[PDB]
Amino acid sequence: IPPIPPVDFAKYGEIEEVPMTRLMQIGATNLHRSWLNVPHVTQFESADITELEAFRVAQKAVAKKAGVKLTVLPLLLKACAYLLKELPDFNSSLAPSGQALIRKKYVHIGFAVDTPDGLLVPVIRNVDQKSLLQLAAEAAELAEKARSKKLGADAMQGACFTISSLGHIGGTAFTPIVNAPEVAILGVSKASMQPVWDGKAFQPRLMLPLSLSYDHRVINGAAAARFTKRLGDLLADIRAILL
Amino acid sequence: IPPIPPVDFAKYGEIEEVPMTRLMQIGATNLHRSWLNVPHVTQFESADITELEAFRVAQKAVAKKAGVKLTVLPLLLKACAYLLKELPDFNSSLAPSGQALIRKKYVHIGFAVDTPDGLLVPVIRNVDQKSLLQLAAEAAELAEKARSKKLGADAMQGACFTISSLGHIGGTAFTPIVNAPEVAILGVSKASMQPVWDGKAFQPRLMLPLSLSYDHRVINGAAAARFTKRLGDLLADIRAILL
Amino acid sequence: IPPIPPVDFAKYGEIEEVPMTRLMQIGATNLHRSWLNVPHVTQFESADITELEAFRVAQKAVAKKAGVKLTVLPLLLKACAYLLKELPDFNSSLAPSGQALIRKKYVHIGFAVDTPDGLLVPVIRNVDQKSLLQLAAEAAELAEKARSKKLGADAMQGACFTISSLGHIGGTAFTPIVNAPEVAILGVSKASMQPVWDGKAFQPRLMLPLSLSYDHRVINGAAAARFTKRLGDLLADIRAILL
């Protein structure tokens, strides 16, 4: 690939060199390797989380009594786990022959924690088997270890799918990069109150923005529009996971 | 381009290998070849199709009497054909010297059909010359042959532009990949009722989401914002094609 | 990278070759070099510019008396300059070792002018030091020289960041390509009146669409969501630049 020509930047004013951490350098190499290997598409969708949110908020005491804080991440993790089993092509990886998919029968999901040294993506194993307060506790443990440089490489391995949430900061949508060899990543941005047509008038509904990027060699446009459709439906009534 | 390191996926749980069809493998190679050759941009726009939709729906009897079903695809095909003639850089391909564009004086348009064996993109020739019920019938014939593995390579050749519609499944927008050597592709997602400011108050208007990806070597940001602007204007009053 | 197979396009109808200007050819080579070097993400945000717009419009006489026209570009340039100093990683470039960032202590910003011969990106130096009417005048001078082929390469050098505005034509958002070796570019699309929840009811607010693409090796998802968040906050009350 052609390199970028170097520029004498000091010709235009004062410059200062600061170095990158090794974590950043690893980060950079992996993103660029994903970028060039994966033909990326992003499918955008909005989910109605008005009731999910009122559930989250009422279980605040139960959560506090358990010493965990119930955020949105466990509710996303649980729904994505159910879905990674309903639609197994999203839970798989392209075999190195390029002629086979390796379907995984396990669901482990990573989540992006941006730390000062750089990006870490801790993995929660068997997300399909744990409960909202278990996932709540573990997510928080893993993120604290990640921030404290005390996360062991053991916990950064063999994820199936990644959730990347920037909802705590802002934004409307973004296009995340697939964390190859995984085949998809869900970006989540900030929920807003929004007018939604009910057949007669517009009703304010709390809308969550989802941005699914996927590896188009393995997932086609319709499979991906179906994944964000189902996910928006599960987040609108999470009781459907019960059936 | 660096390869992705292979991972022993069975270290994390049970895995199963399923193989890809040859169609998928062709599909995969072409997308990756497009990805690396085309610097992609996507221009998003919403068109007001409230009246186009009420037209579509009233001509339901005429269409049924003709044995065709009038969906939105022919109305998109007709408008894009008019536009591919108004703005000819969208109807062209980069010459292999990289120093010339080959402008095509014919308008043939492909459309994405996702089939079980993989993605096929049948082509309707001289879209500028056929009528809404002719395009309606042909589109449906071609898609059935595509699903039935009875489409001949003859009908997969020499398109100018591609329409990719996921509106029948869901979603808000996506970023399609240019089907090189073509120079643009229109993605169409799901229409929603939306409040639109009329100068005084908001009016519910049925809005269609368009996502134009283009080859930025050949099309610049302003030409592309002008294409989705014109297309949104033609879909708001399709009678302007008459003049 | 595999090449695209050549197609005999004349097999499907009449074709015509028109050649590309040298400007286009330069343009094309740079975009493709950026595409393959930069793992791109785009962060989308909407800023409430209702009051900024009413300011712009009232200062129309002051501006006319000064012989300049006050558009939105100077208000974006000033706010981005303040921000490029608050969040210095956006004002930097990846060193050729790939192990250092070169932080620039100067703020010069380019802006995309699409001209008939192709794309030019004139640079306004020390944007942090000039005032809204100075930036208004200079922006317009530079764009006229650009259109007139009288811009000297001197003025196309050593920018830190690029603004690309298509708001004058239309669109909802797009994904611009980073002008490497810079690390980010702000795309601006068309402002619309929009219902915005105020805690009780929806209020029409004039919303401006921003699309920040960035070099993910150097900028992480959270730094970028923070940049568009701050920028939306500064454009909502530009007096905060005063403090």
Ligand SMILES: CC(C)(COP(=O)(O)OP(=O)(O)OC[C@H]1O[C@@H](n2cnc3c(N)ncnc32)[C@H](O)[C@@H]1OP(=O)(O)O)[C@@H](O)C(=O)NCCC(=O)NCCS
């Ligand atoms: C469990 C944990 C790992 C993730 O939590 P989370 O789901 O991000 O939620 P947080 O509590 O961090 O978010 C902060 C606030 O923004 C809110 N927020 C989160 N997602 C939001 C969304 N998508 N839309 C709008 N607001 C959101 C939270 O509910 C929370 O509100 P509060 O302060 O009133 O409780 C958490 O302990 C943590 O470490 N948080 C830090 C932020 C982070 O790195 N998140 C990464 C998730 S991929």
Ligand SMILES: CC(C)(COP(=O)(O)OP(=O)(O)OC[C@H]1O[C@@H](n2cnc3c(N)ncnc32)[C@H](O)[C@@H]1OP(=O)(O)O)[C@@H](O)C(=O)NCCC(=O)NCCS
């Ligand atoms: C002509 C043909 C090829 C394409 O049809 P189409 O324009 O996709 O429309 P369909 O009838 O398939 O769509 C199914 C339903 O979703 C609706 N729909 C389609 N586009 C929509 C949009 N953009 N927004 C919202 N709803 C939409 C349709 O109008 C239709 O409604 P109905 O069931 O009440 O009639 C059709 O015969 C076919 O094979 N359809 C299958 C779907 C498909 O592969 N489409 C590919 C188009 S690129």
Ligand SMILES: CC(C)(COP(=O)(O)OP(=O)(O)OC[C@H]1O[C@@H](n2cnc3c(N)ncnc32)[C@H](O)[C@@H]1OP(=O)(O)O)[C@@H](O)C(=O)NCCC(=O)NCCS
């Ligand atoms: C200063 C200059 C360089 C840029 O101006 P600008 O900020 O683009 O504004 P313009 O005056 O060109 O825009 C044309 C009209 O669309 C409006 N417009 C601009 N940005 C808009 C936005 N983001 N949303 C909605 N409308 C917008 C303008 O305010 C203007 O309205 P008017 O005709 O009623 O005055 C200008 O002199 C120029 O050369 N303009 C030509 C367009 C151009 O190339 N702009 C490139 C900016 S990166």
Ligand SMILES: NC(=O)CCCC[C@@H](S)CCS
């Ligand atoms: N884990 C890594 O070392 C590479 C970076 C992660 C890939 C995704 S999270 C990028 C999101 S935009």
Ligand SMILES: NC(=O)CCCC[C@@H](S)CCS
């Ligand atoms: N026709 C092919 O064999 C390649 C795949 C099509 C390119 C476009 S439709 C991708 C849309 S996201």
Ligand SMILES: NC(=O)CCCC[C@@H](S)CCS
């Ligand atoms: N300046 C150049 O010669 C290359 C093209 C500019 C890069 C950006 S503005 C592309 C915006 S989508």
